[PDB]
Structure formats: C-alpha cells, structure tokens
C-alpha cells in the first residue's frame, strides 16, 4: 500500500539505475500509464510525442 507519487519516483529510480533518468521513465510513465516496467519497455520502443 503506497501512494501514487512514492512508487512513481521508485519507478524512476529502478528504471533509472537502468540508464534511464527520472524524466525519461516518468514521462515513460505518462506513456506507460504509471507503470514502471512498461515505463522502461517504453524507454526502449522510444519516446514519441
């Protein structure tokens, strides 16, 4: 049980260590629906917009 924000920055930090700044992954979250794993699978496919 964690708030939206918390886990959010936690997504960033995980996917972060994975060579993905908080912004690319968080924006990837905006493009992942808030998901992290998808956030990075997103980091992959690309960052269109």
């Amino acid at each position: 049980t964690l708030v939206t924000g918390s886990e959010y920055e936690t997504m960033l930090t995980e996917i972060m260590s994975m060579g993905y700044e908080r912004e690319r992954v968080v924006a990837a979250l905006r493009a992942s629906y808030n998901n992290p794993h998808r956030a990075v699978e997103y980091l992959l496919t690309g960052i269109p917009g």
Partner: protein, 76 residues
C-alpha cells in the same frame, strides 16, 4: 568468477561464470537456475544489450559485475 544478475523484481541471482563464456551460455545458466526461457531474457551491462554470440570478455565484464535482466513478453 562470480557475477550478479539483478532482475526487475528485486531478486538478484549469483552465477559462476568464466569471461570466455558466451552470452547464450549465460542465458542457459539463468534458465537452469530460475527457469526463465532464454528467448525472454534481455541482458544489460554498462548500457549495452548483450548479444548471444559474444563472450563476457568482449564486453570487459570483470568479477563481481552486475548485469540487469529485463524480460521480454506479451503475457503473464
């Protein structure tokens, strides 16, 4: 030499390998110990995706290095 493989669920697996091993071999050791099919494994080190036919030495992976494992899948 011991290496660490960190997965996305916060589990880290330790493997015993030689720099001369191929990436394909590493993936087979991970399947053997955790059951993940090699075709679902994406291995990342120093921001490069590792290719099956290269060896660990090709990438300058030294003892106690950590590789990241991302799973590729369309299902759960």
């Amino acid at each position: 030499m011991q290496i660490f493989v960190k997965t996305l669920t916060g589990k880290t697996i330790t493997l015993e390998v030689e720099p001369s091993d191929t990436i394909e071999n590493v993936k087979a050791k991970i399947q053997d110990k955790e059951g993940i099919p090699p075709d679902q494994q994406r291995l990342i080190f120093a921001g490069k995706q590792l290719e099956d036919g290269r060896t660990l030495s090709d990438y300058n992976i030294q003892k106690e290095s950590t590789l990241h494992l991302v799973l590729r899948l369309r299902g759960g």
